[PDB]
Design a protein around this nucleic acid. Sequence first.
RNA 1: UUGAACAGAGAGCAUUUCCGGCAGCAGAGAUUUCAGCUGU
Lengths: 461, 374, 182, 166, 516
Amino acid sequence: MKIKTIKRSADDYVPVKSTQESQMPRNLNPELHPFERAREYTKALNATKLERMFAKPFVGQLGYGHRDGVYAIAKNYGSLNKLATGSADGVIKYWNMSTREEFVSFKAHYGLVTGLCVTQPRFHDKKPDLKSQNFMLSCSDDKTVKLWSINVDDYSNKNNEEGLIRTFDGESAFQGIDSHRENSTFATGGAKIHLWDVNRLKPVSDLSWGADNITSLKFNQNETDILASTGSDNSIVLYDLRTNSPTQKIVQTMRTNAICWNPMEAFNFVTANEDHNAYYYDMRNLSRSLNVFKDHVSAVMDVDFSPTGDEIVTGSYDKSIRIYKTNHGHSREIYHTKRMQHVFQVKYSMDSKYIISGSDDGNVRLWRSKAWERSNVKTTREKNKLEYDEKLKERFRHMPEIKRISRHRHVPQVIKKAQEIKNIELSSIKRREANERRTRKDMPYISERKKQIVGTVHKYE
Amino acid sequence: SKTRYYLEQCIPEMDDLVEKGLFTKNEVSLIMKKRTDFEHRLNSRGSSINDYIKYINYESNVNKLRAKRCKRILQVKKTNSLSDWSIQQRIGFIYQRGTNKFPQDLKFWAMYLNYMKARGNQTSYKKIHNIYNQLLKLHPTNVDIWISCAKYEYEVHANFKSCRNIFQNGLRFNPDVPKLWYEYVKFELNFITKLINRRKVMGLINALRGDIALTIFDVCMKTLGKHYINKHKGYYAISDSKMNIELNKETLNYLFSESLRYIKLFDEFLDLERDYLINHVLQFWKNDMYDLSLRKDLPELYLKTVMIDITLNIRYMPVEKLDIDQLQLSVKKYFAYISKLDSASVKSLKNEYRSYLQDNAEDDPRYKILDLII
Amino acid sequence: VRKLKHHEQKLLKKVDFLEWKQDQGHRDTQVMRTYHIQNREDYHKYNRICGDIRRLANKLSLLPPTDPFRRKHEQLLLDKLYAMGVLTTKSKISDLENKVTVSAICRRRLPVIMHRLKMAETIQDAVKFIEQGHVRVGPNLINDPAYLVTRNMEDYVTWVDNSKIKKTLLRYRNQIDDFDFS
Amino acid sequence: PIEYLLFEEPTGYAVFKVKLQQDDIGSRLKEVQEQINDFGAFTKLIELVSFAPFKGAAEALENANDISEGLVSESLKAILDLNLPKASSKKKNITLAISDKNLGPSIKEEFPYVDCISNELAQDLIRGVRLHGEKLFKGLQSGDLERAQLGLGHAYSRAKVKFSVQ
Amino acid sequence: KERENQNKFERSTYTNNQTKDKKLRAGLKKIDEQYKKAVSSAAATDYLLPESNGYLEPENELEKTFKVQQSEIKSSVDVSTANKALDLSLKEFGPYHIKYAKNGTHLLITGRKGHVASMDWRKGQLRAELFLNETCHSATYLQNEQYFAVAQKKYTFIYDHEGTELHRLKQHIEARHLDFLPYHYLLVTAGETGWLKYHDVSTGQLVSELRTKAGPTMAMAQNPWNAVMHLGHSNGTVSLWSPSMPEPLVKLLSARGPVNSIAIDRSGYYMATTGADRSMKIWDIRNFKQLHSVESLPTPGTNVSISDTGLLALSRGPHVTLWKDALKLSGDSKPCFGSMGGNPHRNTPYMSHLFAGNKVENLGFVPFEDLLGVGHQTGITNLIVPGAGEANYDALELNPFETKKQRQEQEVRTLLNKLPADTITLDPNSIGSVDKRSSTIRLNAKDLAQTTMDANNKAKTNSDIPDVKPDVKGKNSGLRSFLRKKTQNVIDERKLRVQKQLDKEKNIRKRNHQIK
RNA sequence: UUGAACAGAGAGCAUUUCCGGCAGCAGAGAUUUCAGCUGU
C-alpha cells in the first residue's frame, strides 16, 4: 500500500539564516478566506473613519496677511510655489509659499488693486530674464495698469531694479485683468474691455459688446486666444482674438462673479455667480449648463479648477470654501474657520494638492485639497494601503453606515441654519409646483441646467 | 510582497511550457518551489550576490534542460512560443536586479556583460550600450572597464569614432594610469595599420599617419609627469631643493621607464613606417627634460637612448645586409660617444660588441663581422 | 495587548482583554486576595447574603417611618448582625445598607479573627495553621478556613493542647509545664 | 524639478538622480521635514548614478580648495560632462541641485545648458544625503568617509594657515 | 485563460429571474473584463502552491484500506509525523475533551474532573496546567494560545496564557459547548439551560441571549463559512442561529431522538449530524437537501468531525471510522461499512481504529497536518490520517510557524478588522446588496411623479381595489375576500366602493348567467 | 518662423525589407556555442 503524508520540512517555512524574513505561503481558496464581503466592508468603514480623523486640512496662513483684506490673487502657471496677492489698500505682495514669506511688497496703487496677474513679458527689444525676475502686473480703480518685476531666488546661476518697469494708463477705471499665455498680450476689463500688449502704452483694441461695463476676465489656458468676461448686466461674453471681436454672450438671472476655464478640456468653463451656485458651461453650446454645483448658501465669489481638470474649488460670501467633483454637482468638502471672513479669492495651486484662499480680514491661507492626505513621500506598503482604501471607500460609498460618516462635517451655525431653511423653502416650492402641475394643462418641465439662462444671442438650431 | 509579484510573473511561461507538451505539472511545481526559494532569498533582507549567481545558474540549467527536452519530445529546436525567450529574459532581469542592488562587484558586472554579449542575435547592442553606460558611470576610475568597452566596440563592431570617444573620455577621467595611455596608442596604431592595409588591399585588387600616436605620446609624457609630481610630494611642497631635485629626477626615471616600455612594445607594429614611428619617439626623448638627463645624472638612460639610436636601423635578423650597409654609422656612433664619455665609453663599446655578436661560410661573413667589431 | 498606536487606540477604544464591566472591577479577586480566600465562589456565596440583607433593608425602609413592625425588625436584624459580628455598631440603620459588605463577613472568618487576636503573624499563616490542625474553638478542632466566628464565640479560639505552637510559645517564656503535656 | 544632485565629499564627487520630487509648498511640514530623517523614504527620493573617487589626498586637497573658493575643477568637469545630458542652453536647461550659490556660476560658465539650484529644497536634499552618507553609496568607495574627513580637514587647515614643519 | 480549476474561484451573482447608456455600458464591460481577469489570475496560483495533499492508496485488491494499522502508518511515514502522532496517558482525571488552536500549534485538553492543560503539543512546552477541582466540561482558545475559555461546574471562566483567571462570566450559567468565532471575536456558549449566548471577547460585552426553547443543547457546531451556529436538540432538530434574530434562522429535522453530534465542512456546504437513533445524516446546507441517511449504525455515533480536505470521522464509542469522499451528492458516496461482494460503488471506510479500552470523548482534526486528535477516557491520541489536512495553508490568514511579533501584530490587525455580530447572515454575500424590498429597478422620479399621480387617483379609478370580473366563481371573487378579511363593523370609503364594485360584479354575472 | 549640411540620442511610431528554415564549405572562441557565400 502506497502512503504519503504532509511533509512540511521546516526549511521552506522558517529560514535558516536569522537575518532574512519568513516565507509567507499563500493559498487563494475562498474556503481559506471566508468573509470576503464583510471583511472589506469593515476595511472600508475603518477607512472612512480614519479619513474623518485624519482630516486636518489647514496648512497655514502665509506671512502676516495684508492690512485691508485680500481681493486679488494670482498664481503663476510655471512655478509651483509663487503667488501674488493684492488687498484693498493698494498693496500687492509676492509670496514664496514654501517658506510662507513675501519676496517683496509694493505700495502699488492708491485705490483698491482690483486685478493682478503674472506675465512672461515678451519684449522685442529686451530679453526676459525669467530665471531671476518674475513679473506681475496689476490694475486698479485709479485708472492705472502697472507692471512690476521681482527678484527671485530659485536658481543660483547669476551673481537689481525690482519695481515698476512700466505704467499703462487708461482714461477710466479698470476692474479685472488677465494675461494671455503667449505673445505679450493681456486684457483689462473695467468701464470697457481693452486688449493690451506690454510694448505699446495704449490699448491695441477695444472689444466691447455694448456700452455696459465689464466686471471680470479670464483668458483660456489652451486655445489661448479665447477670452471670457462677466458684465454687470448679468452677462457672460466670449471673445475671440483671431477675429478680434466678441463671439457670443448669454444673459443669466444674477451676476457672474468669476469664470475659470477647464485646463484639460479647453472649451468648458465654470462660472461662479450670485445665486448661490456655480455653472459648468460648454463654449460650443451655451444654451444649457452641463453642471450646476449647488451647495453654497450665499453669493459665490470665486471659482478655480484643479490643474488636473477633475475638481473645482469655490469660495463664497458665506465665510466658507467648498470643493466639488466636476461630475457630481454637490460639494465634496467644505472648509471654514471662525477666523476666516468672506472668502473673496480662491486659487488651486499647480500641484493640484493645495488650495489658496484669500479672505477679507487680510489673510491668505493654505489648505489641503484632500484633507486626510499627507505630503510626505510614501513607501510602497503605505502607498498600496492608501490606494486600496481609496478603492474600497469608492466601492462601498453608498452603504448607509459609511455614507453617513463620509458625508459628515461640522458647518458653522449660520450656514447650518441657512441650509435647513433653504431646505424647507425648496421643499415648499416643490410641493406648490407639484400642486400647480396637477391642475394646469401645459406646464413645461424645465431642466435645472436651463433654469438660470434668461437668454442667449446667436440662437441655436 | 514582491516575491509574490515575481513568482506570478513566472506563470505564463509555464502555462505555455505545459501546453507545449514537454514539462508536466508535477515537475513544473518542483521548478517553481526552487524558484520560490530563490526569489525569496533575492528580495528579502540579508541578500547576497551569491544568491543572485546561484539563481542565474539554476535558471540557465533549467533552460538547458528545456532545450534538451524540446529536442527530444517535439523534435524542434525552438517552439517559437513564449517559453524559449522568457527564461533568458528572466536571467537578464536577475542580472539587472543584482547590479542595481550590489553595484560593486565587477565579477558580477562582467558576468552580466558576458551573458548579454553571448546571447547573440537576440540581444541588442544598444542594450549592451546601456549597461556599459551605467557601469562606466559608477566606476569611472576603474580602467579595465574603459578598455573592455572600447575593445567590444572596436574588435567586434569596428566603430572607430565611438572607440576614440571612449578612450578620450577615459583619459579625461583617470589621466594617471599608464595602462590606458598604452592601450590608446595601441588602438591608434591598430586603426592606422588597418587603414594602410585596406589601402594596400585596394591597390592589390584594383597624410593620415602615426603622428596621432606621437601626439598622444607627447601628452602621455606631459600629463604622466604632471600627475606623478602631484601624486608624490602629496600634501604640500614643504621640501628643500635637495628633495625637489630628487623628486624631479625620480619622475624623469618613472616617465622614461614607461617610454622604454613604449618602444619595447612599439617595435612589433611593423606594417607602417616603423622606422619613422620609432625615430619620432627617439627625437621626443632626445630633448631636454629640465633636469639634465644628458649633462648630469640619468647618464645611463642617455647611454640607453644612444644605444637605441645606434641599433635603430640595426634592428635586423642574422642576414646582416643592413649591417654591411651602415655599420659605419654604428662605428661613428661609438666614436662620437667615446669622444666624450669616460666609463660609458667602454660600456657602450663592450655593449655594442656583445649585442652585435649575440644578434649576428655564414660564420666567415660573421668572421668579417667579428673582425669589424673586434 | 500590543500598546496600540494613536489611530488604533482612537479606532477601538472599548477593547480590553482583561478588565470587563461584568467583572465589577475584580472585587471578588480583590477581597479574596485581602482575606486569603481559597475557593472562587465564597465571594459570591457571601454576596448573596449581603444582597439578602440589603434587599430586606430596602423593603423595610420603604415602610412608614413610625410603625412598630419596621422599627422592631430593623432593630432585630441590626442586633443579629452585630452579635454575629458582621456589623460593628448597632446604632444607625444606614449600616444595613452601607456597612453590610462581603469584606465584613470575610473579616469574621477564622484566619482573620486569628490574625487580629495576634495568634498568627499573617492571614496566610493563620490559614496554614488551621489547615494543619492546630486551632480549636471550644473543645473541638476546627479544620477549615472559612469558619465564621461570632462575637461570643471568639473567646474560645485557642490552640489545641499538645500543639507544637503552644509548646514553643510556652517554652519561649519558659512557662512550659510538661505535666499537662505543654 | 530638481533633476540631478551634486554631492561633494572627501572621497570624491557623487552625482545622484532625483527620482521623486519632494513637496515644494508643503516643504516646511512635519512629515516632509522628517522624511529626510527616515532612510526608508529618502531612498524613494534619491538614487546614486555616479561616483568619481579622487586620486589621493593631493587631488582631494586641490578639490577641497576649489570647492571652498567656488571653482569647478577638472574632476568636476569630467563627472558633470559624463553624467548630465546635453540639454539646450535656451530652452529647458538640465537642473542640477548644488549646495553652493557661488559655485553655481562656475558651473554655468562651463556648461551653459545647466541651471543650478541651491534653495531650501536642494539644501534639505543635500543634507539628507549628508545625513545618510555611506548607506546611499551601496558600498562603492574605498576608504572610510570619516577617516578621509579627518585627513582632509587637517590638510585643509594646515594649507590655509601655512603650517611649516621646519 | 481557460484554467481547468476556475469554478473553485468563481463568484456567484444576482440574476433578474443590454443597456442604452454608453458610459454605463462601457463601465460594465470593464467590470466583466476585470472579473474574468481576476478569476483567471487567481486560479493560476495552483502552480505556486508548494505542497501536495496526503493520501493512502491500496495498489492491490486484497489490500483494503480500513484494515491498515496505526503502527503500520507510523512505520511507513517519516519521523517528524511519527513524532507528531502523540499519546498522553492521563488516567486519573476524567475523559478528556480535546481542542486544537486554529493553527495546529497548541492543544487544550480538559479532564472531566478538573485537569485543564494548554500546551504546545509539538514542542514539549506546556504553558498552563491548572487543576480546577470542579467538573469541567469543555474549553476553547479564543484568538490565540494566549487566552482560553473553560466551561466549569456552572460558570464559564476565561484564563490567560499562563493560566491566571481573567474572567468569571456571571452569565453563561451552564455551558457544555463553547466555540469561538474568530473573525467576529465572539465566544458562543450553550448547554443545559436552553439558551445560546454570544459574548464579545474584545469589548467584554454579552452580545446576545437567545432562547433555544428546546431544552438543553445536545450538540453544537459552527459553520466556518458564514458563522451561524447549528445546535442539535433533544427533538432530533438542528437549528441554525444568528445573534441578530431571536428566532432560529432555520430549523431542520435531522434525526429521531436527540442529536448527538454536528459537524460542518469548512466550505459551508455539507453538515454531518449523528443522532441517538443510530443514524448518521449528511445534509446539504445551502439548499437544505438531505444528501445521505446512513441508518442503523451498530451503536450510536457519539461524534462526527470533518477535516479540511473533506474526510468524515465518525466515532461510536471505542471505534473511530473515517470515510473519504462521503460528502458528495451521488448515492455511490453513501458511507457503507462493507462492500457486499466487492462493489466499487460502495463507500467503505477510508480507515478505522479501535480504542479497545475506552469510549472516546471527542474528535478534532489537527488543522494543517495529517492527524486526527481523539480525546478519550485515558487522555489524548493523535492518529496519522493521511488524507486529512490542508497541505497549503495561507500564511496571512493563520500561520503554523508564526512568531511572537507576528502573533502580536496579527492580533491587533484582526482586532481592528473584527466583523460586527450583525453581519452574520445565512449567506455571507448579502451585505453589499440592496434590500429584497425597494424595487429592483432604480426609479427616475418621472415614475415617482406617476406613482404619486395614481396614488392621488386611487379613488375614482379603483386601482387599489380588485378589478371587476364576473366569471371567477364569485364565492372566491376577490372583492368578497376583501370584504371578509376586513373587520365587519367599521365603514370606510374604500370598503364602500368595494361593496359598490362587488354589486356591479354580481349584476354583470347575473346578466351573463341569464344570456348563457 | 523656415531651410541647409553637420553632430548625435535610444527616448518614441510603422510594415511585409530581411533574419530567428536546411545543408555544402572555410572562418571564431573556449567538444559546446559563434560568424558568411550557392540553392531548397
